[PDB]
Design an enzyme around this catalytic site. Sequence first.
Site, short mmCIF file in Angstrom:
data_model
loop_
_atom_site.label_atom_id
_atom_site.label_comp_id
_atom_site.label_asym_id
_atom_site.label_seq_id
_atom_site.Cartn_x
_atom_site.Cartn_y
_atom_site.Cartn_z
N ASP A 8 0.90 -1.14 -0.31
CA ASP A 8 0.02 0.28 -0.49
C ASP A 8 0.96 1.23 -0.06
O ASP A 8 2.07 1.02 0.13
CB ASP A 8 -1.09 0.23 1.89
N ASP A 10 0.68 4.95 1.20
CA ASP A 10 -0.34 6.08 2.73
C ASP A 10 0.45 5.10 3.84
O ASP A 10 -0.86 3.91 3.62
CB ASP A 10 -0.93 6.86 2.18
N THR A 122 -2.87 1.13 -4.64
CA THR A 122 -3.31 2.64 -2.89
C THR A 122 -4.89 2.87 -3.54
O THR A 122 -4.39 3.42 -5.20
CB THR A 122 -2.06 3.51 -2.59
N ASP A 184 -2.18 -1.07 6.50
CA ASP A 184 -2.17 -0.46 7.80
C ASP A 184 -3.44 -0.05 7.85
O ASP A 184 -3.72 -0.13 8.86
CB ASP A 184 -1.47 0.86 7.82
N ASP A 334 38.42 10.19 -14.98
CA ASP A 334 39.90 9.90 -15.35
C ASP A 334 39.96 10.60 -16.51
O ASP A 334 40.55 11.77 -16.62
CB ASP A 334 40.29 8.23 -15.71
N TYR A 382 52.77 2.43 -18.96
CA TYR A 382 51.92 1.60 -20.21
C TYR A 382 51.25 3.24 -20.92
O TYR A 382 51.26 2.82 -22.71
CB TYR A 382 50.76 1.46 -19.10
N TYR A 465 45.47 9.25 -25.81
CA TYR A 465 47.02 9.06 -25.20
C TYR A 465 47.16 9.33 -26.65
O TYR A 465 48.86 9.46 -26.13
CB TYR A 465 46.70 7.69 -24.75
N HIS A 523 40.41 2.38 -8.86
CA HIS A 523 40.78 3.78 -9.72
C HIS A 523 39.33 4.04 -10.31
O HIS A 523 38.85 5.40 -11.23
CB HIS A 523 41.63 3.44 -11.25
#
Lengths: 547, 547
Positions: A8, A10, A122, A184, A334, A382, A465, A523
Amino acid sequence: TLRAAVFDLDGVLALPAVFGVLGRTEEALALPRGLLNDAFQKGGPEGATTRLMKGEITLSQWIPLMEENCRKCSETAKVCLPKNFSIKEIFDKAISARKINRPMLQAALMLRKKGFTTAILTNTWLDDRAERDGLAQLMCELKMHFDFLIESCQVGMVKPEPQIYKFLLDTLKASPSEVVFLDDIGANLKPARDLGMVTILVQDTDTALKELEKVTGIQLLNTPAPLPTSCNPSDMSHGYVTVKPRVRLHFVELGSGPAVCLCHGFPESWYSWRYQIPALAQAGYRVLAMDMKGYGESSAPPEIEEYCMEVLCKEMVTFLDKLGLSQAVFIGHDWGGMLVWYMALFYPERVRAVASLNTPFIPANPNMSPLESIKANPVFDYQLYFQEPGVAEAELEQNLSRTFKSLFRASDESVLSMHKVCEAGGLFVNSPEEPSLSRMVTEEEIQFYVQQFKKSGFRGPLNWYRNMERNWKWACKSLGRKILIPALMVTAEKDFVLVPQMSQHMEDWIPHLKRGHIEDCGHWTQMDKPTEVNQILIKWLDSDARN
Amino acid sequence: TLRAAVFDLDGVLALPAVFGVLGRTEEALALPRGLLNDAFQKGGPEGATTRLMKGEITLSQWIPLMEENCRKCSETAKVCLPKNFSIKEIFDKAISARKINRPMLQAALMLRKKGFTTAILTNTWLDDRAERDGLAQLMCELKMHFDFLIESCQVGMVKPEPQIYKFLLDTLKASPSEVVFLDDIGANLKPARDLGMVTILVQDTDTALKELEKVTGIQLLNTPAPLPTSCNPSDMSHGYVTVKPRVRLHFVELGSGPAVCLCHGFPESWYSWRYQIPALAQAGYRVLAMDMKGYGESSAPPEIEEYCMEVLCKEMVTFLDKLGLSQAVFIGHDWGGMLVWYMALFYPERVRAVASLNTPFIPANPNMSPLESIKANPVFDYQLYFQEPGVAEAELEQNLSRTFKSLFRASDESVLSMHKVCEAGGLFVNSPEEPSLSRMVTEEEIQFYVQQFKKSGFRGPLNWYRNMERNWKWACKSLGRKILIPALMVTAEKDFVLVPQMSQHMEDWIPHLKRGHIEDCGHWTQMDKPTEVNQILIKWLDSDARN
Ligand SMILES: O=C(O)CCCNC(=O)NC1CCCCC1
Ligand SMILES: O=C(O)CCCNC(=O)NC1CCCCC1
Ligand SMILES: [Mg+2]
Ligand SMILES: [Mg+2]
C-alpha cells in the site's frame, strides 16, 4: 509458494500517513476526537471521498466538498471550527510531509531482486493542486522500483471493494495463494484475506517487515546497505547530437534541473555512471551521461588528431550549443576528468561548475616535453605502450571479455602491473586468460562493455593517449590562468595510477578548490564506491553548482 | 564582388558597448574625463587588458589588475576614487546591460540568407565571473546565426594586430576584396582596410546598415519582419525513449528550463514546431518536440487500438517517467491538442500546464455515440472516410509530395473540401495533381515531411481516427472532472475544420482558462503564424507555467 508482494502507499511505502493528519489536526485544534475523520468518510461509497478515490472528481474539486462535510460534522457535534481552518492548508502540509519509507521500499526491492513480482495498490486521487509536483516526484521515484502501480483513481475501483483485488490478481498473473499484501488499514486486508492471499497489518515498519520476512523466508530486516539504483540501458532516453559532419555524440539523459554532464574515462562508457545517473537525477539535476568521442554509440574516427584535447573540448562546447545549453556542470573521471579541467580553463563561460574523480589537474610543464615527463613516472609506463598505433589495439581487442574483467577490479583484486607493461611487452602478458569476476561488476555488466566495444574497438579510445605533444602545446596557452569557478576534486585512496598525492598542488591553480576523498577505493571510482561518490557529488552540487 | 561580412560584437552586434561604460561611469562619478579608459588601456600590447583579450588571463584575474591601474591613473591625475568603487560592480552591470542589436543581427542574417559567408570577429575574454552565464546565453544565441565566431581570447590574437585579420581571411576562404568588416573602433578598421577589404565605421546602426546595404547591394534596412528562427534537422539533438517493448518515441530537444512537450497533429511531425522550438528554448524553456506515436522516427505499430487516446496518454506518461521528469508543460496542436487536454484530465500530476492550438476541449456526450456526433458535422465528414482501414492510406500514400503540398496551405490557398470528401469518394478527387507551393512552406520543408512519411506511411497516423468508440468510453470516465491547472486555448480564425466557436463552452470545464486568438490563420497554425504563436505561447509560459 509466495511469488508476489503488494504494498500500500500511504502508511506503508510513504509516511507519515496522510490519512493520519486528520487525527493529529483534531488534537492540535482541540476539536472533538474523530471529527475530521468523520467529515472525510461522510457518505461512504456515495460520499465525496470515494468519488475522489475512484477518479470521478479531482482533489481540487474534492477540497470544497470536504469543507462542507467538516461543517456539517461540527454541527451535529455542536462545535465550531477555527477561523483559519483550511483543508487545502491541512492536506498540503500533510502530503508534502509524507516521505518514502526507505526500509519498506528497500524490502520491496529485495523481494523483487529475488524473483518476486511487486506491486503498489493504493487508493489515491487525481492531484491537480498547485503543489502537485511534490506528489508527482514521489510517485516518479517509487514507480520505477515496482512491476505495477495500481492507483484507485486510475482504475475506477477502490479498496475494500473486492473487485479491485481481482483486478490485482489478474494484473499480477498470480493466484491468491502466492501473494502477500501489506496495508495499514485492516478493512483493506479482509477482502484479500478472503481470496486466500497472505496479509500483513502494518502498524510499525520493523514488525511489519518481520512478518514479511517470516512469511517469505527472505532476509529483509537488518540487511546490509544495498547498492544505489543502477539504470537499465533499454529504459534510458538516448540522445544523439552531430557536432561535426563525421562526428556524432551519444548520451543518456535523466532528470530535470541544472544540466550535469558526465564524462567517463578509458576504456569506459556512459554506463560507467550507471550508479550516479539515477542518484543525481533524483537529487534534482538533469543528467547527461556521455559516450565520449571514440566510444559506444558516439562516433569513432580513426585519425589521431581527432582526439587531441582541444578538438575534444571544442566538440563538447558544440554539444552544449546544439542542445541549447549555455552551461552544464562538468563532472569527469579519468580521461574525462582531464577533459573537464580543460573545459573549465578554456571555456569557463560554459562550465557551471567542474568536478573530477581521481584525475588531478596538473598544468603543462613549459620546459619538460610530455614524453619526458611521462617517462619520469614508472606507473605511467603503460602510456608509452599505447603510443604505437595498432599494438595496444590488438591486445585489448583480442578478447574483450578478458580485457574488461582484467581491468575492472577493486583495489585488492588487481592482476595487472601498469609499471612493467612496456618491459613485459604487453598489458595482459602475465594476466589470467579467464580472470575471475570482480566484486564490483556482474557478468552482465561486463558484457555490456563487451558489446559497446565491438562497435569501434580501441583505436579511438587509445587515440586519447596519442596527442601528448599537441595537448601539451595547447595547455601551455593556459599557464597564466587559474580556475576560479566552482571546482571539486575527489581523490581515491587506492588508485595506484592516479594517486591522491598527485593533486596536492591543485590549490595553486584553484584557490577555492573543494575536496573529497574516498578510502579503500580503486581507480574505477564510480563502480567501486557508488554510494560515497553519489553522496560527495550531490553534496557538492547542492552547495556550489545549484546556487 | 563581396562574398562575406564580418561583424564586431561589442558596439556592433551588441549594445550598449561595454567599452563605453568606462566613460559613462566617469561622468556619473564626476571623475576626470577618460580616467577609467586610461586605466583600461594601461600598458598597451603589454598591458593587463591585452593579456586578458588574448586569453592569457581570465576576466576574474584581470579585475584586480584593472583596479590597480585605476588607482595609478588617478594618482598621476591627482584624483581620488569613490569608496564603493568596484570594477566588478561596474562591468557586471555593463555586461548584463549589453543586449543583441537586433537590426544588426537581422542584417547579418539577411546577407547570410543571400549567400554571404558571415562571421564574428571580436576581442573578448574568458569570462569566469559568477555571472558568466549571462554572456554565455548571449553568445549561445548569436553563435548559431553566423558561419564563424572568432574570439580573440580563443585564438591568442587581437585586433588591431594584422595577424588576426589574416587568420580571418584564411578562416573565411576569401580574399580581402570580397569581405566587408564592420567595427565601431576605427583603429580596428585600418588593418582590414590595408589588406584591401571593405570597412564600415559603425557609430549608429541605421547609418552603418545604409553603408552596408549600399556596398552589398542588398535590402537590409526597412526590410519586412522576417520569419523566426527555424531549426535544421541535422543540427538538433535527437532523443529516443522506449516506452513499451515495441514502442519507441522520438523527439528533438533544445534549451534548458521547465520541460515543454510539443505534440503535433495529423499528418505532421516534430518538424511542425520548427519555428517555436528555437523561440521557446530561447525564452528559457527545455523544449521536447515529439514525433507522436505513428510518425517519423517514432514507432508505428499497425494495430488500431495501439492509438486509442488512453494508450497514447499512458505512453506519454511513461515517456516522462523514463526521462526522469515529474512534469512537463504540454502544448499540442490538432490531434496533439486533443491529447494534451486528456493528459491534463487523467494525469494532472504530470502536467505543469496545458495548451492547445486550434483543438478545443470538448467533453464526450454521455448519450450520443461518437459516430453519430461526428456525422452531425458536415466538415467532419472526412473522419468517416478515414475509418475503413487501407482506403485513406492508399490515397495519402500514392503521391506524398502531392499530399503535403495539397494539405499544407494558408487559409486562402485551399484546394480541398473536407465537407464533400465521402461524397467525392476521396480526399484529393478534385484536387491538382501538382499543387502549387504554399507560401507557408518551401519545397525543401515539403520534402522533409515526404521522407519522414516514407518510413511508416499513414496507417499509424490514420489509426488515431479509428478509436472513436474507445476514446468516447474512456473520456466518459472524466465527465465529472474539471481542468483546474493552468490552461491556454489558442483559436485560429480561418481554421475551417477546428473553428474557433467550437471552444466557446470550454470555460465550463476550465474556469480559469486563458485564451489567445490568431487572425487570418488557417489550420496549420505553427506554419501559418509562427511569430504570433511564439509570442502567445511565451507570454503564457512566462506567466502561468514558469511560476
Ligand atoms: O586502471 C588502470 O590500471 C589503468 C587506467 C588507465 N587510466 C589512464 O590512463 N588515465 C589517464 C588520465 C589522464 C592523465 C593520465 C592518466
Ligand atoms: O487541414 C485540414 O483540412 C484537415 C486536418 C485534419 N485534422 C483533424 O482531423 N483534426 C482532428 C483533431 C481531433 C478532433 C477532431 C479533428
Ligand atoms: Mg493506507
Ligand atoms: Mg567594438
